[PDB]
Amino acid sequence: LEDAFPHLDLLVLDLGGDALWYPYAVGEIQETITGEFKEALPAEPWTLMPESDAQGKVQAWHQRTKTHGGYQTQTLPADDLWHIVINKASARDEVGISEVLRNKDEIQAFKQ
Amino acid sequence: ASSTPQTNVDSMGGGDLTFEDLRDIKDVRDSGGQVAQLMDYKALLNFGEGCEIHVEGDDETKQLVDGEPMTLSEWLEDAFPHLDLLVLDLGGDALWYPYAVGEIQETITGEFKEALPAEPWTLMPESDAQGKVQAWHQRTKTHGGYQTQTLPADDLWHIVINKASARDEVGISEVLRNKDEIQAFKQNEAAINQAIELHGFPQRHVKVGKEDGAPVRDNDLRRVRTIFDPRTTDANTAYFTGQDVDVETLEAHNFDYSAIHEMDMRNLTTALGLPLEAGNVGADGLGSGKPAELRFALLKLAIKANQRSFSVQFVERVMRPVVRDYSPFDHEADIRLEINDPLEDIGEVADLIQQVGDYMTNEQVAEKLDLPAPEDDEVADSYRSPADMEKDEAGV
Amino acid sequence: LEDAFPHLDLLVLDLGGDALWYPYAVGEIQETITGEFKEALPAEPWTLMPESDAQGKVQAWHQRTKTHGGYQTQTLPADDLWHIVINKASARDEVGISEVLRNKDEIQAFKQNEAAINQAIELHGFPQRHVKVGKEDGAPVRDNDLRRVRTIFDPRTTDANTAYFTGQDVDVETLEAHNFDYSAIHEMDMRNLTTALGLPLEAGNVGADGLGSGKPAELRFALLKLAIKANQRSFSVQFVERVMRPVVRDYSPFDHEADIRLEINDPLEDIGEVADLIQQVGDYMTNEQVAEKLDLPAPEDDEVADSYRSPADMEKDEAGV
Amino acid sequence: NEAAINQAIELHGFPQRHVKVGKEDGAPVRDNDLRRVRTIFDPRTTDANTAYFTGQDVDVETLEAHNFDYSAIHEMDMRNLTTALGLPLEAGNVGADGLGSGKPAELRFALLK
Amino acid sequence: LAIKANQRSFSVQFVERVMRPVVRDYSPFDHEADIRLEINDPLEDIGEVADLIQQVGDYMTNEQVAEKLDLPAPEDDEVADSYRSPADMEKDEAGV
């Protein structure tokens, strides 16, 4: 595991930072061409949103990204992404709460 | 005596709280700001330091679970791996809401999966003449409307920290209880913010014309507004005028918003049972000596009471049913869940162990010091240090 | 008894809390269907009141409880309930005093002064803007005229750095925040309430000069500890007599006339001070006395428990032997 | 003295609003006229950040909170009562200068014992 | 306390959703093993830990001392498992 995740300190700070700012940290598992493990690749959390079933489990991920003055869109299955939620509404919440959007009023009050 | 309560229990058939009231608790909890952070701090003090499972006579329980020897404690630790997270989630819910409520979940194979917390604002209990919960009524949002369902109380479990009485199976929300202090705080906060905008900053007043002189009209003031516009003014602008232009200041008008904040925070913290210090507010004479000892003692006593209430109900309503239904072990065993003291100082424990370690078995020392007890039973059971036994054994 | 009453810590806090709020704590003994002891079941003390004979002993219990928008009433014999009284008029009083009904005046005085402070902060804690329009002895200004001025100076649309341009006959005046010492009124109210309820002032998040240190502090905390002991002893005695001994008599093979004691722990005990004591005078204490003071299980071995020198010192001498 | 302090705090511990209507030596204002002014300045319906627009002949005066040392009166009352009942002053939640320390403290606690 | 709660929430989910799938899919090892990710305490004082080790080190195995002190554990198992200091074991082995 230490050989598989050599730079886990940096990854923990990146993902943990994302999960405090955003509702989730989210990313992929990447492979070498030979099919050995390359890395856990963090995705950009502002680009991705989850689609959930009736019991609140994430089934698909919807991505919007800027290119050439427009936006590309794609949908990805939940089967090959992974995600982490620090701030939850309830123990059943897989989508989570942004501390920024939660405290948006205090943030704008401060700035004003 | 008798096998049924012969005293009555003061509620059936109504004239206790609605789904709308349950969603008011949700709104306070998700609205953020200072109220939400204080009640989160309360949840962390009560439940955030984590857990430990004790079984009395645990070694006697040694049994092959699945071709491997386990004790009941070892089985329970495998059954509930993330009990620290569950304790904080359920404990937080039971402080905010009247209850924490949830299911038992099974793998398809029929082995135990988890105790699954439900969303407490979605569920309300239906109770009999003696106040026992017979059914649970759930309301949940989907597709711009509400689904409803009734579940029997036979396959849910629930935990109440805040009781009206020792017979109350429904409980009290601290948020709905202290709703007046919460709104009083929020209203005074809004009042201070609005007052700072109007009164915290000086404002320029330009008066044009001579007193008892020629009248100045609106179009005239438009040209003066252009000359004295704060938008285009810089720090070292100089003004040249005739005698009949007066530049006046609406001053910053003094009010002690700090004192109003301290009062609001004191009212709110005392109402929620936290010390004033949790609100980022200090007080004279209270920070030191026996005054400090008393207030931090009062806090630790409140934490112990909440912890014990939770421990007992969790063991009785979650763990014992799981041991009965999914385990080879005896469900009548002495299971205890202890929740750690958040304000424990290991330096004070270490001082105690130096002073009176000569009276403690090595396992009693290891328990206080939060370590695995010695592997060797005679070493665990003896009074002198394991290192002192080693140097004497090595000498011999 | 420990098996009969597993969660006695919770029961003690529930009943003891009730007996401080209410005149009494009251409840039933309950049986499993098989006839073994189930629990002591606290009743709701606001639902029950005692009926007493000429010598003040409770003969019957009268219960009133809400259901279906009305009240059920029933009478129960005193033979199968039990009750505990902390606050008494006299040592013959079996009915007791509510501290809340006793101190009702201080409670309502506190609440009224609190409400008054809150209302006074709303009116007087913040400056208010007073725009005065017209010349003194000038033309009169009417309500419709003031509506247009109100639009110019509206606090709702004003920002922090708004500038005002006027003729000479508009005056922007201020109702200042009018100073009153709400902090001192709060301290007085909290002092009155805490002293009435017997708590030290520090319990109310209020401090006081000269009281926080030295022999002044020692006295007030000693007074608090004495009050706690008295309440604890009263509860301990009555719980053993009215709950535990009947349970031992009716559901147990043991003798009910034994010396049962319930001790309730001291909330303000410092283990560091106990440890200091054990260093200084441990040479005069049996190992069981040390274990009791230090809140440990006593030694398993009787001669080790009964001896005066440390169990570790006995082990190193047995090891030397 | 306790009842006197309580009554005095209600009357004098809080500021009160005095709206004066009309010009001095001006037109007289009658009770029915003041009822409409009362409706405008009602402390019940007022909020903290209300603003007032008037002509020159409305004066919003304040009865200030009038200073008295109720703390000192309480200390005096408590000193009298505690000394009469033979308790130290500290039993009454009241402190005193110089008495909290040294041989002064030793004497009073010795007298109690 | 707030830091501990966030750390445990992250740790648990990272092991379950990232590490265990990787152990399953790309590794010869058993994915059902007891993996833990601990995230270090930012406000820990090593002086306080060193004070504690002086006072109650006589009750700690050498590996427990090494864990608290953020060192590699002793290479020799009986040295790691024993209670008295590795230096005290050495001076007794040397005396012998």
Ligand SMILES: [Mg+2]
């Ligand atoms: Mg003219």
